[PDB]
Design a protein around this ligand. Structure first.
Ligand SMILES: *C[C@H]1C[C@@](O)(C(=O)O)C[C@@H](O)[C@@H]1O
Ligand SMILES: *C[C@H]1C[C@@](O)(C(=O)O)C[C@@H](O)[C@@H]1O
Lengths: 252, 252
């Protein structure tokens, strides 16, 4: 497996890495959240850019990224604009999405970007290449907030992300039953056992899916999301409790 | 679901109940373990009779049961002779197994007994009837310490235990792969959602299976074993850590 090492953190080995999302509506709230987050314990900071209400200005977006970087200079920083199509807070044009991501990449302020698989193949390849040209890793992503696809369809998507050059494929799906949670775990393990060429992140969302956020070490999810004070998706638990469970499982 | 209530403990609702096994060779060792276990927090005490030396004398076995009952008067007490055939510490004749179990039952000293499904149909039925006639619950059990049967075979076993009057069907199986852990979870969920009318206990043993000991509330296992200082089977984790995880999952 080609692991991803960012600021001395090895993604794809050991205990799943803990990601938390920063959500602030404006520059002052982003600053305050970045400061407050320093005392929480986690491995990677995701900035959920689609929660920022001045995405209209590239300057405002980059200044917010810089505020976060300056508060947490040694933390892996992941820039994520979640599109409305895939469960995010606001709709913007594909060109605006690509522009924000390219600006994040070439600014040097972030270590990683989230790129949605179904943005379009040509645009995805171009943006992956641009990320790599500037020493930025790509978490390539897919979300189903309505239901859980078959294990086979989930594996297909993850393999497509690999084929497009993703550093870390990621899929999040919504269970409609406890059975659907097992389907997600099954897909994760299939990736782990058979298509194991780089780290993958998976999760089944919502209350029923919580176990999938805890069991990454066993079935092969390289990272997991917790909540500092507000969750960025259904099913995230308090980050200290997440960490406690991951440690108990790792040492069992 | 019809629950099983013992000494104010409701098995089959809420958080999975914590069972610990007491293992001692003789009266003094059983006393020392019972005393040490006062510092631990758990829901049910299993006496693993097959770890006792003088199992030949019904009197010796009953005197030890009485010592444990009197050491822990308010704790649900489960009498378990695990046969060597099913992963226990020593062999026993079927007739002497019946004698010990009947004596335990009619002594008033125990709340529950473990009865192995594969003991034989006549002996199982007679012992279930005897248990019930004396207000003792039956944990009817099956263990494979080598491998994991198919989910279909496991579900059929659990349903057979229900049909034979088990108060709590129980199966423990050994994974040879991570896939086998998911098979056990699948069987558990199937049984709980489609066939069970009473609590069931399931586990995938060993390190690989530990998630099954943690995820009972989600997939349908009503109880789980932890270790105070020594495990009674591979994969049991420290009882306080078990409790921490169960609480986090329950409140998620
Ligand atoms: C990757 C994606 C995962 C979540 O949807 C989740 O934890 O379910 C949260 C989002 O903030 C992430 O971008
Ligand atoms: C019921 C059975 C379960 C264990 O084998 C286990 O936790 O895997 C432990 C034994 O002591 C129990 O009798």
């Amino acid at each position: 497996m080609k692991t991803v090492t960012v600021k001395n953190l090895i993604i794809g080995e050991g205990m799943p890495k803990i990601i938390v999302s920063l959500m602030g509506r404006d520059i002052n709230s982003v600053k305050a959240e970045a400061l407050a987050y320093r005392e929480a314990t986690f491995d990677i900071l995701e900035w959920r850019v689609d929660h920022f209400m001045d995405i209209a200005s590239t300057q405002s977006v980059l200044t917010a990224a810089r505020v976060i970087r300056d508060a947490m200079p040694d933390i892996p920083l992941l820039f994520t604009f979640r599109s409305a199509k895939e469960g995010g807070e606001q709709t913007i044009t594909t060109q605006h999405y690509l522009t924000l991501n390219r600006a994040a990449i070439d600014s040097g302020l972030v270590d990683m970007i989230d790129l949605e698989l179904f943005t379009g193949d040509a645009d995805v390849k171009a943006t992956v290449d641009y990320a790599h040209a500037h020493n930025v890793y790509v978490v390539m992503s897919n979300h189903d907030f309505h239901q859980t696809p078959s294990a086979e369809e989930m594996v297909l998507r993850l393999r497509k992300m690999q084929a497009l050059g993703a550093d870390i494929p990621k899929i999040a799906v919504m269970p409609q039953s406890k059975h659907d949670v097992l389907t997600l775990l099954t897909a994760t393990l299939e990736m782990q056992q058979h298509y194991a060429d780089r780290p993958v992140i998976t999760m089944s969302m919502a209350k029923e899916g919580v176990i999938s956020r805890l069991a990454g070490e066993v079935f092969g999810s390289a990272a997991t999301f917790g909540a500092v004070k507000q969750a960025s998706a259904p099913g995230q638990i308090a980050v200290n409790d997440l960490r406690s469970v991951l440690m108990i499982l790792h040492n069992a």
